[PDB]
Amino acid sequence: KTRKESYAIYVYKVLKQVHPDTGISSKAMSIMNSFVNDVFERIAGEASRLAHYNKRSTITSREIQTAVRLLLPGELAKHAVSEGTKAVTKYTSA
Amino acid sequence: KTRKESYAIYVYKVLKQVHPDTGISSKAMSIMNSFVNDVFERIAGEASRLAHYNKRSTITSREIQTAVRLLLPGELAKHAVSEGTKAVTKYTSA
Amino acid sequence: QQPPCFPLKIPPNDPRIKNQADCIPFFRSCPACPGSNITIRNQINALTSFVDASMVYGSEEPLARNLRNMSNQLGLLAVNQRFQDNGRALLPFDNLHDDPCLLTNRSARIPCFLAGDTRSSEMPELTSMHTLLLREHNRLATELKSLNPRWDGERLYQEARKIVGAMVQIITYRDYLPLVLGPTAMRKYLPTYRSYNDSVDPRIANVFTNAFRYGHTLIQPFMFRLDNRYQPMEPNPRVPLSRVFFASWRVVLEGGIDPILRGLMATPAKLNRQNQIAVDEIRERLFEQVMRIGLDLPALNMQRSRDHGLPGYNAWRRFCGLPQPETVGQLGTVLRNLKLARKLMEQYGTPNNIDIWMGGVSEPLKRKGRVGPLLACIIGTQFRKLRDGDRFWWENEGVFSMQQRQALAQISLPRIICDNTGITTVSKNNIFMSNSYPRDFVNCSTLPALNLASWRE
Amino acid sequence: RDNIQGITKPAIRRLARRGGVKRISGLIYEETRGVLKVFLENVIRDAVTYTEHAKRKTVTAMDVVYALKRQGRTLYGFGG
Amino acid sequence: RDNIQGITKPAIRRLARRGGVKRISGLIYEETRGVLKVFLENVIRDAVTYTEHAKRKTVTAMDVVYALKRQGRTLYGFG
Amino acid sequence: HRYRPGTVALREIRRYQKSTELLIRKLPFQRLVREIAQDFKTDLRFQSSAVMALQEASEAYLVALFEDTNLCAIHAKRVTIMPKDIQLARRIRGER
Amino acid sequence: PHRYRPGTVALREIRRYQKSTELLIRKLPFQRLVREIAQDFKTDLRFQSSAVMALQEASEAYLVALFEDTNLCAIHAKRVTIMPKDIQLARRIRGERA
Amino acid sequence: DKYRTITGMCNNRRSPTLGASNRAFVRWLPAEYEDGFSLPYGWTPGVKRNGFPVALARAVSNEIVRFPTDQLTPDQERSLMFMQWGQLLDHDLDFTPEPA
Amino acid sequence: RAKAKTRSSRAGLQFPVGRVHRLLRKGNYAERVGAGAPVYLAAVLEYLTAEILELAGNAARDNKKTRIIPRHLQLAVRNDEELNKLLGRVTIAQGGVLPNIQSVLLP
Amino acid sequence: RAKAKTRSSRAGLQFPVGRVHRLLRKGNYAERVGAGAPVYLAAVLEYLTAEILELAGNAARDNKKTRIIPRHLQLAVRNDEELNKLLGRVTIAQGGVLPNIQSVLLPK
DNA sequence: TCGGATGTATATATCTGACACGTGCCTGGAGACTAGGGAGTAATCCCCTTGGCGGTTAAAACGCGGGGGACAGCGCGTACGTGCGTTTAAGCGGTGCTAGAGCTGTCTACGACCAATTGAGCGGCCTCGGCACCGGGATTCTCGA
DNA sequence: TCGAGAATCCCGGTGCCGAGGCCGCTCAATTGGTCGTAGACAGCTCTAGCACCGCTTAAACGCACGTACGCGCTGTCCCCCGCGTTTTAACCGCCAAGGGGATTACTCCCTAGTCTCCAGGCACGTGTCAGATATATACATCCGA
Ligand code: HEM
Ligand SMILES: *[C@@H]1O[C@H](CO)[C@@H](O)[C@H](O)[C@H]1NC(C)=O
Ligand SMILES: *[C@@H]1O[C@H](CO)[C@@H](O)[C@H](O)[C@H]1NC(C)=O
């Protein structure tokens, strides 16, 4: 059978990080997978449009940051930005 | 200075085909140019999505035809399809 | 000048008719209700105002029954009992008191044909179209009988008639009208079908009989016949049009309908230009052999428009919502020609006096169309009324089954042409648009046939 | 072939109850049936176009999801 | 900086007349000013984000066009 | 015993706003979907998930439209919903 | 002293402003409001003239459409006067304040 | 109401004779006659139309429609099947009889 | 080599085919672009432009004007059902609004 | 060759940096994709997932259940302003509706 | 306004199927290395944005009178909600067949990729006529008799 | 209906500035081969979609009552509209500075692309425990006396 990759193992790992005593069903897992795919596609499309607007041929972390600022509403966006920045900083340290 | 391209001369050629004795202003030309760019981007994006869904690496006349069918409303779409088909046929003959 | 004669007066310095006292023959149309004067005059439509292939099956009961091949129980149509085109059916001959067909060639002694219309013998081309439709009906009846052995003659005949009518409607409204009106006019005047509307009047208007004369501007001066290789077929590859009028002997005794169809499929039509309206063959040598003197098609059109009491050019411009010119400059702006406007104003004196046909064919054509705005308006309105007011429209629910509808939606004229007779190479999609051989021709081994498997009971 | 009457009056009443409606007029049901038919026609037309482009004969769930996303009605829980 | 009062009552009345409104209550002017302020704040925030990404200090017309298009409010005539 | 008109209505409102089930019978909806799709293509097959997704989308659409209709009805100082409320909601939403 | 009955000049204004394409808000106050609003997000910002013109066009179109929906809401409740509750209902059904 | 009546009658239920054959044409505009009832423009010599003399149709065909034959311009996008189908559909639609 | 011939002339169009092909290739749409996609897209764009311009020119002529202004484009778009549905979320600058007064407001 | 370590481990994330990089490269978004873009995107997706899952788990606990079903996800989304704005035009299957009744309909 | 009836939440047993692990394996991600071009600096250029002033006048502000909608109150009748009894297909099972969706293999023709050539389109420059206002009257609509 | 007063509309001047047509270059498009992989076939398997059939039984469907709500119909009054008189600042026209978009070099870094290998993540198999399903009970609420 052909493999079908999905964001199920990672979503379960995050859930175990947040709620150690709470499980999840299959329909809820499908909903979360769809949510992750949708948000990924939205952010990537906004970043691609931003790169096209400024006549650049590269998607960088600045494009992702601006796409997150444009799409996510209010306080959410701010927090998201912080998280992303931290990751890159750690990724640079290693 | 620089070189900025637009759908200005072609819109004027089409206008002289339809209304040989009617002119057009600058704001109307800007609106027509924006309309052409917008419709191009819509059809091209729909065709790209269609190609991605079916795991294809090529945008062909079938993708463009399906995108035109999906986007353009009502009998309009039908007429558009005919025009496009004719062009391709002629392009193959010559 | 006595009724019912309305002869055409000859102006001085006429190129052809030197004698001014001579007159071109002309007969006024029959009144709707003669014997009275208070009621306004009206003309009679002798045919059903529907797209139901009433040119093959007739419009009156006696003629319709006489057309049927009433000796068997297969529901076929009568064919010729003396001649055949390579073993293929021809139209039955007709007996008339004064047959113009025999006047063209006394030696041949070949009479006119019989069909659903009395004018089916003007040229070999119209006769070829009628014969092709007759052969298609016979083939459909044979196939329906073979597939359904329980059906009697009447049911087979009626089903074949319905299929042929639906085929004519499909071909017309899917290929012919867009090439006449153009995309904009077709979208404006014939939008997407919704449903049958009993409040819509499908009667043919009086102006439509003069607003569909536009095809008189597409006539070529010669008839072309081609062999199997689409080469000029000898003898007489190109025949002058003045010698093919009412000449049925050129069909039975000159190789059948195959060369005529081949010539039709692969010959460009005449382009209508403001300086080239109509050819001289139909303007000076129309019905030369049949009548004492040649007729004049544009003059006959204008005289008939006068006889029918139709309003002028400006009245119809107002009816269709277009601007109405009043002076020479306005006419030159509208027609996009100043010499033509000057000539028209010299002839008539005011745009209100211009006849409907002359004004309609004098306008610049639409984009990707063959008519001006006024003629496009009239023709589109008439055909929309015909489509919406028809209870037996092929797209109407209850007339055809969905599988039958999908089967019918794949028919085409080239398929019928290369199915019902011997031509193997035919034109591509939109036969009305392809005229170059062999750039846009196929062997019709690729075009699918009509699937009658959905007609099995 | 009158399956639009399979959407019964009790079903429409339940759908209105979920929407917070306390009293319903007697002519609401025909209007609701028309609205539902229009919505279904649009969505199914788009889904069938998507299916035809793939040269398939079965309308999969992904075609419906893509059609809904086209109309601006993203749906979670089916496909991806 | 109380420039929201620069959108005067006669201007709102003209905008309502273009919309086909015959009679106008005396309390819709403040509501209209609030609605316009909210719309302008959203659009200008998006436009300033677009300007900041390009490392510019001038808000061009293309930034406004992109900001409007991001909200499903495509505007024709400004490139 | 008999309840006053409006008590069982509120009880049903409370009951159906706590559940997550589908309120339309599956077989009539499947038949309706197949009949509608008959007009576009002949001999069409449907995955079960396709019909399920169509039903979920239709139910969500109808529930949201009924909420808007209730708002329109209350605006006119009424308690019952009428077809004109549905028409106004669909006109403001832009679906007309 | 000639006097028009109430609602006559209102209909005349409706006919007159639905026939023109001009901008119905004074340009300088709108520019000042735009600059004041933009002050919050960034400091020492410059604006192209085309940017302010585009903002004005978009704002006026938005307000005109909102007023059309508000008029429909008013007529629904058997009224002629336009009240704030009509604006709120139109914005809620549109989804702006939902 | 299963098949088409050969005369076109009973197609319309409201008006059974509407759209059938051997009936009068429908007039989209009121008729215009030189006398008012049944006389065409040109029946009586010296009678003007709209304040202008009535032109001869033969003359109009003579110096407006006429063009030399050798200047014929073929149509690059249409075939003769276009005109043939036009004539066939026309012979389907209408026909105005005249006395013999 | 032989004389150059544009693809637009070969296809019989007025809109460019080479430029549309380049825009499709460099627009990050797909890995490869077919040879008939630019022709189809150019034909569709030309058809839509011709429709809009014909309606706008008719509107301008009814206004006793020679040139086309944004008001005429707005009148053309809003008075056509299909075009209004296509450009339903589009604002045309200096276009105004369609004349329409509710019946209840009239005296 | 040393022992391989996933880029998500270096970035301290749970979501896959490498898979996100491949999806960005194959998705026809841009000609080139930077090295720091996948890290940022994975971090943002992980943050959003954690937020929504925490809210859904709180709803499930309030409902006295130890497993998340679509009803809990819908309750979590519709009760948060930012999440509701993010998913305004999104339908959740088997999610139901938020219980509210207009005060006009209540008995008086 | 204290008692009866209906409805719904709660606590306790029973059973089940689906979710959470375990294990094998394959393929895609990580570790190196190289090569080329995209973007980051810097250094000018000149454009267009901001800031100022003065006069004219059109529009915004204020005030006043009146009339015509907004809103509350009050019947009146009818149509919708609530039960109740009688059809009616919906849902659940187990059974069977076969259409077609998905996978594997081969191969060929079509699109990307180079180089060389040139002409189509863009920028700059005139130039004249369509349009925007001026005057005047002409026609129509509205409100008081 | 009839007349007076405003308002809008329909025609001749009168410039003027923007749209349309003409040159000069140069930078994409076109023409002419090469090549390698994406897609177009054929076969083939097996999964899942369609059809059928019998049984409960929960849902839907008519029918009857009555009550509460939708809908007109007054009546008041106050809030908004129309109009005239003062302010006010928008608008136009003209100058002057300088900030900062916008090209143009040059040169690094940063990313794509290629082998190699080798563990993270799928598919498949299993079992047990959340959760669905009865059953009785007990509060909670509603409508009437
Ligand atoms: C091709 C050569 C044709 C010839 C020689 C011819 C001959 C004639 C003549 C002489 C008439 C006399 C009355 C009239 O002119 O209206 C007539 C009738 C008519 N023709 Fe033509 N015709 C031709 C083609 C066409 C075509 C192609 C069309 C339409 C596309 C057309 C439309 C009509 C109509 C509507 C009539 C009215 C019927 C009648 O008056 O009896 N004709 N034909
Ligand atoms: C039709 O009638 C003709 C008379 O010529 C006859 O030859 C023929 O057999 C009849 N049709 C059939 C199908 O028998
Ligand atoms: C039928 O046609 C008439 C006349 O065009 C039109 O007014 C009417 O709305 C149409 N009826 C339907 C049901 O389409």
Author numbering:
A (entry chain D), B (entry chain H): 28 to 121
C (entry chain N): 121 to 577
D (entry chain F): 23 to 102
E (entry chain B): 23 to 101
F (entry chain E): 39 to 134
G (entry chain A): 38 to 135
H (entry chain M): 5 to 104
I (entry chain G): 11 to 117
Q: What do the authors say?
A:
Here we show how myeloperoxidase (MPO), a highly expressed neutrophil protein, disassembles nucleosomes, thereby facilitating NET formation, yet also binds stably to NETs extracellularly. We describe how the oligomeric status of MPO governs both outcomes. MPO dimers interact with nucleosomal DNA using one protomer and concurrently dock into the nucleosome acidic patch with the other protomer. On the other hand, MPO monomers stably interact with the nucleosome acidic patch without making concomitant DNA contacts, explaining how monomeric MPO binds to and licences NETs to confer hypohalous acid production in the extracellular space.
To further determine the role of disulfide-stabilized dimers for the ability of MPO to evict nucleosomes, we chemically reduced the single disulfide bridge between monomers in native MPO dimers, which efficiently dissociated the particles into stable MPO monomers that were still able to bind to nucleosomes. In cryo-EM, we observed nucleosomes bound by either one or two MPO monomers or by one MPO monomer and one MPO dimer through the same acidic patch interface as in the non-reduced MPO. This shows that MPO reduction did not change the structure of MPO monomers apart from the disulfide-stabilized light chain N terminus, which becomes disordered, and did not change its interaction with the nucleosome. We used the reduced, monomeric MPO in our GATC cleavage assay. Notably, under conditions in which non-reduced, dimeric MPO efficiently allowed DpnII cleavage of nucleosomal DNA, reduced monomeric MPO did not promote cleavage. Only at a 16-fold excess of reduced MPO did we observe faint bands corresponding to the cleavage product. This is a further indication that dimers are required for the ability of MPO to displace nucleosomal DNA and disassemble the nucleosome.
